[PDB]
């Protein structure tokens, strides 16, 4: 069941890299064998000393294990029969139909509950409609906190990839938390009372629902070419910070393609006119992806940092360290290029040169052992961990605005 069985026999290797050698033969791999790459995203972006995660088909298992082996590579199997791990994410014992803050929830059950939070609620939250996707699906924001005048606001989006199901359960997490805490915990009363959260749960909504009806591992927008018969451009690589430049694909066929143009996506251009619009009143910038538990902060296009640098890596800090008190949880941080690697097009980056101080990207649970595949049964924990850095940060922005 949930497409499992599409994957039979298909694996995810985790394997060390220690030299250039090492990466020409996972590219030379890559050539010949089909590989998904999870982590990270481009064979162009590994880096020495580092770990590779990626799937590969099932007809395709032996050979590219027998070039792990032949070239005596360190790896691991993460998962030996990607079927199972696949069934296995939809394992909530929520007992009912229908939207679950617990569960991973379709894109029409998503739409209906912006709605009805919305009107449950109209005196902290206000949906509204900040463009159309490519396919024609109405891309939605919702506005948190209590009505008042000239209020800074803080803005969070998740679903740019359309696999990362975790990213879309936090934005929604974070409107629960909000609606029932909310007149009972001071805290949460303050933030909403003196911030407005622009929380915009699904970008990419046309990648989001073909992950759900033919391709579970699809990540890019839907995006047709009258002439290329590829599909789709990777959203966070299709932003205006050295746009293309650097660790992205020309090639509409691959999973890092930047767009035909910067801004090309309707999904990035909705964004980015948004917060042009509003960029008076946003005073940070917050965006969700999955999976290994870090805290990334500008500059990712380039070897540079901002002149908040300092600022941003003690709050980071701070805020790791607040993440890991409730369960445990260990996150890295840093600035992108040095902490991941170098790649341009970035919504951070670009978010943080428009002058939005404080610019974050999260990669939520878990370290690879699922994957993009985090069991139903870790939403409630990762939400509820994330949750509290979310409020870290906020309150702290209420401390320093600007
Ligand atoms: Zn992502």
């Known amino acids: 069941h949930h497409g499992g069985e599409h994957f039979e026999g298909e694996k995810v290797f985790r394997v060390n890299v220690?030299?250039?050698?090492?990466?020409?033969?996972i590219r030379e791999l890559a050539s010949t064998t089909q590989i998904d790459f999870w982590k990270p995203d481009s064979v162009t972006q590994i880096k020495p000393h580092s770990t590779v995660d990626f799937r590969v088909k099932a007809e395709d298992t032996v050979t590219v294990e027998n070039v792990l082996k032949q070239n005596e590579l360190q790896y691991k199997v993460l998962i030996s029969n990607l079927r199972n791990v696949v069934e296995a994410q939809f394992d909530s014992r929520v007992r009912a139909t229908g939207h679950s803050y617990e569960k991973y929830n379709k894109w029409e059950t998503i739409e209906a509950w912006t709605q009805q939070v919305?009107?449950?609620?109209?005196?902290?939250?206000?949906?509204?409609?900040?463009?159309?996707?490519?396919?024609?699906?109405?891309?939605?924001?919702?506005?948190?906190?209590?009505?008042?005048?000239?209020?800074?606001?803080?803005?969070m989006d998740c679903g740019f990839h359309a696999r990362e199901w975790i990213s879309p359960a936090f934005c929604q997490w974070f409107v629960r938390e909000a609606v029932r805490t909310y007149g009972r915990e001071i805290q949460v009363t303050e933030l909403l009372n003196k911030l407005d959260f622009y929380v915009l749960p699904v970008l990419n909504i046309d990648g989001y629902i073909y992950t759900?009806?033919?391709?579970?591992?699809?990540?890019?927008?839907?995006?047709?070419?009258?002439?290329?018969?590829?599909?789709?451009?990777?959203?966070?690589?299709?932003?205006?910070?050295?746009?293309?430049?650097?660790?992205?694909?020309?090639?509409?066929?691959?999973?890092?393609?930047?767009?035909?143009?910067?801004?090309?996506?309707?999904?990035?251009?909705?964004?980015?006119?948004?917060?042009?619009?509003?960029?008076?009143?946003?005073?940070?910038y917050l965006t969700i992806h999955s999976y290994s538990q870090m805290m990334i902060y500008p500059y990712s296009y380039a070897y540079k940092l901002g002149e908040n640098n300092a600022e941003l890596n003690a709050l980071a800090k701070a805020t790791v360290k607040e993440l890991a008190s409730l369960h445990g949880t260990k996150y890295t941080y840093g600035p992108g290029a040095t902490t991941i690697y170098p790649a341009?097009?970035?919504?951070?980056?670009?978010?943080?040169?428009?002058?939005?101080?404080?610019?974050?990207?999260?990669?939520?649970?878990?370290?690879?052992?699922?994957?993009?595949?985090?069991?139903?049964?870790?939403?409630?924990?990762?939400?509820?961990?994330?949750?509290?850095?979310?409020?870290?940060?906020?309150?702290?922005?209420?401390?320093?605005?600007?």
């Open 18 to 25: 220690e030299d250039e050698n090492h990466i020409n033969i």
């Open 118 to 155: 919305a009107t449950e609620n109209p005196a902290l939250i206000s949906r509204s409609v900040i463009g159309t996707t490519f396919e024609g699906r109405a891309i939605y924001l919702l506005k948190v906190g209590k009505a008042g005048q000239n209020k800074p606001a803080i803005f």
């Open 212 to 284: 759900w009806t033919k391709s579970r591992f699809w990540r890019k927008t839907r995006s047709t070419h009258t002439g290329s018969s590829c599909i789709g451009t990777d959203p966070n690589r299709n932003f205006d910070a050295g746009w293309c430049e650097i660790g992205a694909s020309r090639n509409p066929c691959d999973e890092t393609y930047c767009g035909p143009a910067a801004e090309s996506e309707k999904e990035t251009k909705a964004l980015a006119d948004f917060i042009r619009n509003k960029l008076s009143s946003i005073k940070a």
């Open 344 to 402: 341009a097009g970035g919504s951070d980056d670009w978010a943080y040169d428009q002058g939005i101080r404080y610019s974050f990207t999260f990669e939520l649970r878990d370290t690879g052992r699922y994957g993009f595949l985090l069991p139903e049964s870790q939403i409630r924990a990762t939400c509820e961990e994330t949750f509290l850095a979310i409020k870290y940060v906020a309150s702290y922005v209420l401390e320093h605005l600007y």
